[model samples]
Target chain A: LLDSFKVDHTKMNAPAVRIAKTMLTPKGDNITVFDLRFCIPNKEILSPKGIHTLEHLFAGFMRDHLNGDSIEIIDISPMGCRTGFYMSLIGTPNEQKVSEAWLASMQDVLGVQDQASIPELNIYQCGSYTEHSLEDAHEIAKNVIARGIGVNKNEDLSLD
Target chain B: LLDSFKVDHTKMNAPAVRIAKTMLTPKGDNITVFDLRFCIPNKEILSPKGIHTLEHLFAGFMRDHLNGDSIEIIDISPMGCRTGFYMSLIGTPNEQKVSEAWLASMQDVLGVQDQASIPELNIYQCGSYTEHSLEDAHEIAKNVIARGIGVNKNEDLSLDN
Candidate 1:
């Protein structure tokens, strides 16, 4: 399907630019998103319950503790492929700092033990889910953090 | 070219039944939604910031507080009517429950005074939003919660999923 559209390969490969392109970018808008493409550990092979539970925990984790009030985390969505999740944030030059801070914060959240902080489990559709080990979330965050969020500091910035 | 002002009065004619009808007899596999007219406070109009703020709070508030693990909030969007938001939750029977819960929770959120808690301002086109107050949220919630939750409720005899 993609080949038919004659989509450019090099420009479309960048995480930040990739998501920015897909959002149906408003005529005049700047978008910066943390496009994560990694499989959710354990949960993927577990069940829908596992995946759902983790989404709740991770979402709640960021919203409640992360610099939510200060900077926006536009959205964190599961990829239809079930390979990983996408975290979106929008801003101008100012938001770059928040995105950077989140990189470190991401590591901290992942390190916390005992997956299962979605206290509002009762609020979900199927009632409850496998309280994902915070450690697992931490693992995922660590990988991303080491990678420096959506774009690598060492990456070439020429817009193709 | 697409600026026609024809109104989809079908929903407004009997908002309640319209919601129920869409619930009981949907035309496709897609789930039903309640495109409630945006509530405009009597005193004054909200600025772009205010609108963004209201949408952010309501959208996040609903997602966080309502729905079980199985349910999904398909999307929430503007009506272009200059005053309402459309919330689409996927699934049936459960849709009824979720829709009702959404209304209730929004009521509570609207009433809370902590405007600082909403998501980043830029998400709302980088606009500012007044924090939802308990009084305001409560009134809005009541309007929504009053809808028949879980279907089968009195006057809501829609088919069960």
Candidate 2:
């Protein structure tokens, strides 16, 4: 459609496009800001608390468990609209690797039966805003991440 | 020790035995029970896990940070009829002060720190009856230990903290 309209756009889906902004704190250590967005439907199903739990669970998980040579630092924050969440990593891989790694990690989290030992739960008890158990936190994340790609508002995006 | 005959067991003041019971649980050993019968009024301040935290911190105070080998377990399970906590020794004390040592250990536990790192909190989150926060538990036990001994059921051993 862009080509027909004589637009310079190369592809419909470019990974480099910045959906939100990311910044560091003044102290350069404590978390400061992360601006990100998520689709309305995805947010509805995943919920903010679910994402928040993932943020806490994954932060500690990555640091104590999955973290190694490829990663150095990690931080996560929720979106303003409660539609999606933002994630940050230091000493990270290229886009492809990060996406792939994230998906794989999400898969691992979904399969895990124990959230008590997860780093964030132990270190900071992440994603505790809601009453949902730790077990359900991963389940929501898995379902949202697996749906993948396009869906617009009023598009019936509910997950079982 | 039990077989020995005595002139007046009731009049016989068990100063050493009674004094030892009010102390904290020693880290070197897995478990210890204290008997605080003739002490000051003991009271409950916090939940069970709170007391557990107090016990762990006291162990660190006793051995210093490097005394890991000397301290491993910190069990503060309460007894049936008394106000006290025990201190077992996993490592040799090397002649540490008894009363002052116990008091120093007790002082630090009263302070609070990060909660998420506590193991019992995880258990409580799971909604299980068995898994309670040790720190909270300590708070509860400390109260009873400090409140002195109970007289009867009408006395009402109920605790607030």
Candidate 3:
């Protein structure tokens, strides 16, 4: 029941790439949920193609780099607000570590030359593969990474 | 800082169609967030096409029915898990009333003949109009509504601690 808590959308103006919240578990473990804002919250600014691709690439890269018995990766999902993503993790991890991994993964995704060769695109692998866009994903990933980690100044980040 | 609370994914086996939590505003107004689970939590069971269409129809229907200066339908969106949806409402409507409205709306959506003519599908209207599936949406909506209002069997109602 405690987990059902969500931020009042009215209170949030825009999300920044940062550790939005540190969730305390019943077992006394601390889980981190990152708010990865790629665009403003709404259908107009929501990029299904970009978020779709980013979801695949980010999931794959994180699983590989952050995979371990100690580090349990919960989920990385696109927020309904379309403003950002929620990268949930088990165990207490330094915000910088997760941010670094995300930055590195996005960089790798950007360097990808062949879009088709990207991981988890085949019909057998993904629910909807045709909706992906490597170019758009790369563009958005580049922008998010450029902002680095933690909440930044409002005007400093570009909405475009 | 306290608003970031999240359900531990590991502990949740599945979600029940019920009010997960309610937030009381400064003005004593209540906002209820319903966890509408249409399928199991995973991409394998997830249908972006159906969810997209459902978002459009459900939002439109709820606004028209739940509208007025009294009830403010804030948003209806797909949960990041892709398995279900989160329907947020700004009002004091009981769970039964919201559930009935959702049931009625989905029934209307199920009866729709032309999928393309469905509201909020035009390129200018939707983010990915090509990705929507009215048939799948109707099917899923019907199945979920059939489950009925309130927490079903084996599902416990969580009022949030």
Candidate 4:
């Protein structure tokens, strides 16, 4: 099992960002992963459309804020559980920076009232373009920020 | 843009599986990613439910079939395009074996008429448990096999771009 599953979600403090896993490649590159925790797992899950829209918003903004030729972004995809997302980076990415990056991206999303305003929301640019909601994306983003962004929120004993 | 977006969907031959990219990690391990193209891109996308079911089914059966102490199944997830899945593995996985493993797993999926028969379909086991369909999974699986599985359906030049 991945170290992610080992963490006790029940003990988690919601709206938190935490480093789920990090592995060093033989080439000396680090693959660091973070959990963009947005909700209380098992208690609530974001709408899939909202999750997809937030995912659509991420690729560009996150890349822009996380601008560095050295550290490469792998992907920031929606978790199947619909609670949050899993982001992976090629070089060491600071947990605080990722939290800020997500915050900045969501801040950008707040102004996106038009479907056209959203990046890659079309079939040509995305896989399932129609399954998105700028409205829901707005709601989820606002609430997450309002709840206060946590970096490794509550590093409880249950969490390794 | 990733090479995957460059391919022409109009020219695709359905039910084809192809190795889109193979990257050699600095550690000497190969990260081979395959496109489990189950439908014609643009023309149709698999239902979210069926895709979820297939994804759930995959984690177990794919692991079972891809048996080896060295190789690891990274993930066989539903592509946002919904046309197929993007699977990544740590070691060099044979395309033929992956195709067979998928077929074998889908073959196993065909017999599952009940939700309980499916692996990791429960809410406890899965994140979004209600969003799954064995019926659709069966249909999609059967059609993919019926159309005849293609490993790299069309190795046209667009694929290389």
- Preferred candidate (DockQ higher): 1 or 4: 4
Tens-digit lDDT string for candidate 1 (A29-53): 3333443434322222212333334
What C-alpha lDDT values do all the predictions have?
Answer: 0.38, 0.33, 0.57, 0.68
How well does candidate 2 score on lDDT at residue A6?
22
- Give the alpha carbon lDDT tens digit for every residue of B1-161 in model 2: 10001111222221112222112211212222222222221221222333334433444454443235433222222211112233332223321233334444444555444555543322211112132354553454355346423321111222221
Chain A: TM-score in each model: 0.49, 0.50, 0.73, 0.89
TM-score between candidate 1 and the true structure: 0.35
**Tens digit per residue, CA lDDT, model 2, A24-57:** 2222322111212233321142333455455555
TM-score of chain B of 3: 0.76
Candidate 4 structure lDDT:
0.68
- In angstroms, give how far residue B5 of model 1 lies from its true place: 39
TM-score per prediction, in order, is 0.35, 0.31, 0.51, 0.76
- Please give the distance, in angstroms, between residue B35's alpha carbon in candidate 3 and its true position after superposition: 1.4
Report the CAPRI category for model 2. Answer: incorrect
lDDT-based ranking, best first? 4, 3, 1, 2
lDDT of 3 by residue, A8-127 (tens): 322223325555556443334555556665553333345667776777677667666675655655556665435566666555566566666777887788878778677445433333
Q: Model 3 over residues B1-161: C-alpha lDDT tens digits?
A: 01112232222333245565675443344555666665543333556677767666776776767756656554565653365666655556765676677777778788777786764454333334566778877787677666654543213322233
Question: What DockQ does predicted model 3 obtain?
Answer: 0.06
Residue A104 of model 3: what lDDT? 80
